[PDB]
C-alpha cells in the first residue's frame, strides 16, 4: 500500500526484541520500503489460501504471541536481502529488486516452510517437531535461496539436480546465518526444531551422517522417495561445502579450508554462471572448479581445495 515509511518494534519467535521496517496508512503494515521494491509479510490466518492479508497492526508494536512469526519472517527476509546485495551485489532474488512476499500462520500445525514459485510460506509447526519456522534465519535464507536458484540455474527439483538445488539453499542459508552472526553453526534448522530437545537439528553440514544422511557418493540414495532423495543426497554436497570452507580429513582425503567468504564466492559464481537445470554432481564439481579458477587462478590453493573436497565425497 501507499503510506509513510516508519520503524516498529516487536518480539520474534525466540522471544528476542528487534526493530522492523513498517509502513503507516491508517494502520501500520509489515511493508518494508527500504529494500528494493519492498518486503511484504501476510497473515494466512491458519488457512491455505495465499497470500492472505497484508499484515496490519494498530500501534506499530508487535509483542503479541500471534505476531512473533510475522516479525521474524519480515526481519529475516530483510537480512537475507542485505546479504545478497552487500556480499554478492545481487538485488533481490531476480536481480532486479523483485518484491519479496511471505505469508505466516499457513494452515494448522504445519511443519514446513516453502517457496511456491511466487512467495515464501511458513507454517507454525505442531509445537513438538517444530515451532514457527520463520524463527530460524537459516530456514528463511534457505527458502529465499530457492527463489534465487529458480531465477538463475533453474535446477530441476528431482534426483541429482534437485539435491544440488537443496544443498545450495542449505549452503547460503548457513552463510546468511553467519552473516547475521546469530549463534552461527553448520547445522540446519536448530533454532526451530524440536523445542523439547536441545543440541539437535534437522540436518548437519559438518556431519550429515549424524542424522542418517549420506556423506559420500557411494552412499547416495537411489530410490524414488523425496523426489529422488533431494533432501537426502544434499548431504553429499553439504559435506563438500563444509570441507571447502573449514577443511578436514574425510575418508582419508585431506582438505585445506579456504574460509566461508571464498566458499560463498565460488558457489555463487557456479550457480549464476555455470549451472543449468539438469546439472548433476559431476557437473557441479566442474562448475565449482571453473569458478574457483576464474576467481583465483588454475594453480591456486582455492582450486586445489575444491578438487580435494569433491574427491573426499567421491564426486568425480
Ligand atoms: Ca500491535
Ligand atoms: Ca545457529
Ligand atoms: Ca544453523
Ligand atoms: Ca531441538
Ligand atoms: Zn529446500
Swiss-Prot record:
Protein name from the UniProt record: Thermolysin
UniProt-annotated binding residues for Zn(2+): 142, 146, 166
Q: Does the keyword Hydrolase apply?
A: yes
Q: Which organism is it from?
A: Bacillus thermoproteolyticus
Gene name of the record: npr
Q: Which GO terms describe its biological process?
A: proteolysis
> How is the activity affected by temperature?
Thermostable.
Which sites bind Ca(2+) 2? 138, 177, 185, 187, 190
Q: Where in the cell is it found?
A: Secreted
Listed cofactors:
Ca(2+); Zn(2+)
Residues of the active site are 143, 231 (proton donor)
Q: Where does Ca(2+) 1 bind?
A: 57, 59, 61
Disulfide bridge partners, by residue number: none
Q: Which reaction does it catalyse?
A: Preferential cleavage: Xaa-|-Leu > Xaa-|-Phe
Task: Cite the EC number.
Answer: 3.4.24.27
Recorded GO CC terms? extracellular region
- Family as reported in the entry's similarity comment: Belongs to the peptidase M4 family.
Amino acid at each position: 500500500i501507499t503510506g509513510t515509511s516508519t520503524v516498529g518494534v516487536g518480539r520474534g519467535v525466540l522471544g528476542d526484541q528487534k526493530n522492523i521496517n513498517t509502513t503507516y496508512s491508517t494502520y501500520y503494515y509489515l511493508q518494508d520500503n527500504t529494500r528494493g521494491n519492498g518486503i511484504f509479510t501476510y497473515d494466512a490466518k491458519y488457512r491455505t489460501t495465499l497470500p492472505g492479508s497484508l499484515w496490519a497492526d494498530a500501534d506499530n508494536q508487535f509483542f503479541a504471541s500471534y505476531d512473533a512469526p510475522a516479525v521474524d519472517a519480515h526481519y529475516y527476509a530483510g537480512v537475507t536481502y542485505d546479504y545478497y546485495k552487500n556480499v554478492h551485489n545481487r538485488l533481490s532474488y531476480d536481480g532486479n529488486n523483485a518484491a519479496i512476499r511471505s505469508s505466516v500462520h499457513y494452515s494448522q500445525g504445519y511443519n514446513n516452510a516453502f517457496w511456491n514459485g511466487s512467495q515464501m510460506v511458513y507454517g507454525d509447526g505442531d509445537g513438538q517437531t517444530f515451532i514457527p519456522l520463520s524463527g530460524g534465519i537459516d530456514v528463511v535464507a534457505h527458502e529465499l535461496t530457492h527463489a534465487v536458484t529458480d531465477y538463475t540455474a533453474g535446477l530441476i527439483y528431482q534426483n541429482e539436480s534437485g539435491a544440488i538445488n537443496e544443498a545450495i539453499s542449505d549452503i547460503f542459508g548457513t552463510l546468511v546465518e553467519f552473516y547475521a552472526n546469530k549463534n552461527p553453526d553448520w547445522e540446519i534448522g536448530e533454532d526451530v526444531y524440536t523445542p523439547g530437545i536441545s543440541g539437535d537439528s534437522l540436518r548437519s553440514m559438518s556431519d550429515p551422517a549424524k542424522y542418517g544422511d549420506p556423506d559420500h557418493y557411494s552412499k547416495r540414495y537411489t530410490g524414488t522417495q523425496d523426489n529422488g532423495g533431494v533432501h537426502i543426497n544434499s548431504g553429499i554436497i553439504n559435506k563438500a561445502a563444509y570441507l571447502i570452507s573449514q577443511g578436514g580429513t574425510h575418508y582419508g582425503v585431506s582438505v585445506v579450508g579456504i574460509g566461508r567468504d571464498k566458499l560463498g564466492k565460488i558457489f555463487y559464481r557456479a550457480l549464476t554462471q555455470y549451472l543449468t537445470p539438469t546439472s548433476n554432481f559431476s557437473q557441479l564439481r566442474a562448475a565449482a572448479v571453473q569458478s574457483a579458477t576464474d576467481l583465483y587462478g588454475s594453480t591456486s590453493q582455492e582450486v586445489a581445495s575444491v578438487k580435494q573436497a569433491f574427491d573426499a565425497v567421491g564426486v568425480k
